[PDB]
Amino acid sequence: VHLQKLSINNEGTKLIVLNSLKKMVNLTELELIRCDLERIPHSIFSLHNLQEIDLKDNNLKTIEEIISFQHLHRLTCLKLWYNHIAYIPIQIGNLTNLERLY
Amino acid sequence: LRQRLTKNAQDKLELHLFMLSGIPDTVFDLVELEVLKLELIPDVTIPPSIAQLTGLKELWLYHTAAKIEAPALAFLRENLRALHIKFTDIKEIPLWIYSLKTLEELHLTGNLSAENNRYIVIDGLRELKRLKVLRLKSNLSKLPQVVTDVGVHLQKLSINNEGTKLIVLNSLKKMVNLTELELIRCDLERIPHSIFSLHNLQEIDLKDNNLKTIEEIISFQHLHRLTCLKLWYNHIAYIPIQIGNLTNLERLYLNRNKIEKIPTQLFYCRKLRYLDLSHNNLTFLPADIGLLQNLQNLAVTANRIEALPPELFQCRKLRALHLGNNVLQSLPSRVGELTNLTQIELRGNRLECLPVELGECPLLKRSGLVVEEDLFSTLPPEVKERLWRADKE
Amino acid sequence: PVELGECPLLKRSGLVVEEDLFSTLPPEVKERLWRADKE
Amino acid sequence: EWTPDKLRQKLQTNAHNRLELPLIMLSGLPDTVFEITELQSLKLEIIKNVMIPATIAQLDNLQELCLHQCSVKIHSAALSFLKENLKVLSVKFDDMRELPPWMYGLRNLEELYLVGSLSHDISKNVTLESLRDLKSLKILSIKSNVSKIPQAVVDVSSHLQKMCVHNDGTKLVMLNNLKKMTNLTELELVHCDLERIPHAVFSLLSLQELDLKENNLKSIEEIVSFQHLRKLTVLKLWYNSIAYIPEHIKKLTSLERLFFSHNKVEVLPSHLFLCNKIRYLDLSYNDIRFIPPEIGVLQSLQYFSITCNKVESLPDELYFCKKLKTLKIGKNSLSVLSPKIGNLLFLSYLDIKGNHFEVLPPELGDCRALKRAGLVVEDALFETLPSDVREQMKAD
């Protein structure tokens, strides 16, 4: 309710989210470092205050969950770095509001 | 010793020598010295190497008998200009201090009433023609006549008697050149006619003179030079309206008294720039304060003011608001009008909250805005951050 | 004269005028002259 | 060791705007300290085995004395002068004997700060019940594990006015000693473990304010007699456990300051806002579900804090109340800031931090006393003003 940043480093261990993170109303920077998720759960794009999203070293072959981010008005920086992302879909042209697109 | 160097209220470089056997030669080697403090130095002989002290202008011989010879005497006569001799015996006072030509400030502390030496040891004050400041913390019962002949060239005479009535008899009419008569702790309880007989006084501070009724202020209007009439530390219980005659006053410091109220006619002096009413019995603060457009620091600390009038904020020149320890219910938002306010004392009181308009004041900072931590925290976070950033830099 | 009052150029450390009548000079004149001794 | 110049360096100010000399872990008290006569307050911290000479008669300007964890001794002239002059005292009794027995020979003493600790045999402290010799005492703050209020306070009730007690987990009992308070005006009890408001508070007929800090008030049912406190304007019942607020609030309408921050309140009733004289109302970090519209009755309100609530609905009647200077609605469940918000002319502070908002309306310019600092919000809500409104807002 008052916490605004949660960065979990696990050295290659997958957590069981199970949509138990939706009480992150005040969270603004969800940073999953070396999570190896390969997928984006709905709790990531349900939390309206998230502005920093870096799925680093999570081995995303495809990123497909950016469309549901438009309910989240505060996203401003998609630092999608250090990943297995093979291609960007052309729908990435729909965004306008990012600044530090890394 | 070089890192020992310090500065005074005159922003002059001093050094305090305190239980020294004598003056070290390393002290005299210093050439940037302005004030040398020979305090409790037992019977030290001053060597000619004091000529190395080229900047030396101030010597405070505090219970320090100075033994001197001819070259050091010549250097002091040609250079030294201010000399505050504190003594407990007539022998402690050196006889060469009356031979200095360029001396202009002379301060004595210690009782001077004695047998066959009353106002005779200072008969050498006639040799000193440059004397302008003569402070006598000597508990004297009457002003010496030699000082009266000196007063032709004396511009400042401050007397401290520690509660002893000085026999005036209008004997200060000779010092027509007197400019600052500061009767400190004189316990006069009245104003003699000699105070307003001389025309040259700008600043008249009757500190602890115990005047019950301030009634001789009508005759002060002939004193066109008078702009600082500090009637603090007295039993003035009421201000007669007649002070409205004195329109030239600027620094009226009327604090630490039992003034039941400053009246509207008191504000008839629009020239008042500095006004001190601290530790007083005021009923409230009237509206005619809006007249005093030149007011800079109004000090009503620990007085009885329940509500702050908007006419106080109508003036814009306020700089130092000593409003602490009061019964101010709340501070109005009109303080946002004040720009010259660089410090305001708001600690204590009955202050419910600090208005956000205090952030509108540019010159005000954290050191300026002295208030309790919780009351300061009542302000929004970002304006507090702005004040912090303007403070530290 | 009172012409030694206002201007910031002609002042005591400049002009060492007679100090016997500098006492009867107005305090604002003395303000300019002591301003010389400071400025 | 300590030259007067070193004491000039040590000179500072304190929490009461007095000239303080902080002396820390000293061997004793130098006479050079007493040579300073402009001194207004003395701070002696763990300077034990210290005897106060007659030389303190040099400095007449003293008003405050801080005798902290130090066993101090005394001399006759010192007794006389500190009887005549000293008024403010702040001592810490880490040890019971580190409290000296001579504080009570004075009469001019007005403020007392009794920070420290106490044992089980509370009533045996005859040091407390000698304040009958004090005639001017008006401020008493006892940060100690005091379970029983002494008969000392009972005796000195005629002239005492302020209480501040921090028990820190210690239960306070024997509340008849607080019943026989008569002229007291302020009462700040912290962590006294008072389950219910005693009839002691209602026996007080001239209490300006009450604090029941860190006191487990599960229910508030004794407010019926709170009407006897006509001077009561402040009820700072914060960090408390009041689950619901009943009708008994109608007993007193002179109430002005009302702090229920972090309370257990679920729904506000229709009966709080009848007392129109309330100006200062706090519900910070509570969990209220929603705000009913009867808030429109509180017109003379100047502060309405409900921050970190679960409130999803703010009806427009609090926006109708224009005398509301402060209004903190932060981190609630609200949706959109009201477009007709410029009607509130006297709205000095609107803490709506962390609220789920979408777009700020353009009528913030109509608001005369609302700032970016005042309207604290997340920055993606700050970025929403029209360009001409930015031109008018950067110039306020």
UniProtKB/Swiss-Prot annotation, chain A:
Knocked-out gene: effects: Increased prenatal and postnatal mortality, growth retardation, and multiple tissue abnormalities. B-cell development is slightly impaired, without affecting B-cell function. Mice however show a cell-autonomous early block in thymocyte development and impairs peripheral T-cell expansion and function. Conditional deletion in germ cells leads to abnormal sperm and male infertility: the cytoplasm of late spermatids appears swollen, preventing reduction of the cytoplasm during further development into spermatozoa.
Subcellular location: Cell membrane; Lysosome membrane
Ranges for the LRR repeats: 1-23, 24-47, 48-71, 73-95
Protein origin, superkingdom: Eukaryota
Post-translational modification remark: N-glycosylated.
Entry comment describing in which tissues the protein is expressed: Ubiquitously expressed. High levels detected in the bone marrow; lower levels found in peripheral blood cells. Highly expressed in pancreatic beta cells.
Subunit structure: Heterohexamer; oligomerizes with other LRRC8 proteins (LRRC8B, LRRC8C, LRRC8D and/or LRRC8E) to form a heterohexamer. Can form homohexamers in vitro, but these have lower conductance than heterohexamers. In vivo, the subunit composition may depend primarily on expression levels, and heterooligomeric channels containing various proportions of the different LRRC8 proteins may coexist. Interact with GRB2. Interacts with NOX4; this interaction prevents the ubiquitin-mediated degradation of LRRC8A.
Record note on domains: The volume-regulated anion channel (VRAC) channel forms a trimer of dimers, with symmetry mismatch between the pore-forming domain and the cytosolic LRR repeats, a topology similar to gap junction proteins.
Disease: Defects in Lrrc8a are the cause of ebouriffe (ebo), a spontaneous mutation that causes male sterility. Spermatozoa present in the epididymis display severe malformations, mostly of the tail. A drastic decrease of the spermatid population is observed, whereas spermatogonia and spermatocytes seem moderately affected. Defects are caused by decreased volume-regulated anion channel (VRAC) activity in germ cells. Oogenesis is not affected but embryos derived from ebo/ebo females show early developmental failure.
Protein's job: Essential component of the volume-regulated anion channel (VRAC, also named VSOAC channel), an anion channel required to maintain a constant cell volume in response to extracellular or intracellular osmotic changes. The VRAC channel conducts iodide better than chloride and can also conduct organic osmolytes like taurine. Mediates efflux of amino acids, such as aspartate and glutamate, in response to osmotic stress.
Family: Belongs to the LRRC8 family.
Protein name from the UniProt record: Volume-regulated anion channel subunit LRRC8A
Organism whose genome encodes this protein: Mus musculus (Mouse)
Curated annotation (Swiss-Prot), chain D:
Residues of the full protein shown: 408 to 803 of 803
LRR repeat spans: 2-13, 14-36, 39-59, 60-81, 83-106, 108-130, 134-156, 159-179, 181-204, 206-228, 230-252, 253-275, 277-298, 299-321, 323-344, 345-367, 369-392
Tissue specificity comment: Expressed at very low levels in adipose tissue.
SUBUNIT field: Heterohexamer; oligomerizes with other LRRC8 proteins (LRRC8A, LRRC8B, LRRC8D and/or LRRC8E) to form a heterohexamer. Homoheptamer; inactive, likely because it is not targeted to the plasma membrane in the absence of LRRC8A. In vivo, the subunit composition may depend primarily on expression levels, and heterooligomeric channels containing various proportions of the different LRRC8 proteins may coexist.
Residue ranges, Cytoplasmic side: 1-396
Domain notes: The volume-regulated anion channel (VRAC) channel forms a trimer of dimers, with symmetry mismatch between the pore-forming domain and the cytosolic LRR repeats, a topology similar to gap junction proteins. The cytoplasmic N-terminus preceding the first transmembrane (residues 1-22) regulates volume-regulated anion channel (VRAC) conductance, ion permeability and inactivation gating.
Cell compartments where the protein resides: Cell membrane; Endoplasmic reticulum membrane
Protein name in UniProt: Volume-regulated anion channel subunit LRRC8C
Organism expressing this protein natively: Mus musculus
Protein family (similarity comment): Belongs to the LRRC8 family.
The organism's taxonomic lineage, starting at the top: Eukaryota, Metazoa, Chordata, Craniata, Vertebrata
Induction field: Induced during the earliest stages of adipogenesis.
Disruption phenotype: Mice do not show remarkable changes in body weight or the weight of white adipose tissue on a chow diet, but display significantly lower body weights and fat mass than wild-type mice when fed a high-fat diet. Moreover, improved insulin resistance induced by the high-fat diet is observed.
Summary of the function given for this chain in its UniProt record: Non-essential component of the volume-regulated anion channel (VRAC, also named VSOAC channel), an anion channel required to maintain a constant cell volume in response to extracellular or intracellular osmotic changes. The VRAC channel conducts iodide better than chloride and can also conduct organic osmolytes like taurine. Plays a redundant role in the efflux of amino acids, such as aspartate and glutamate, in response to osmotic stress.
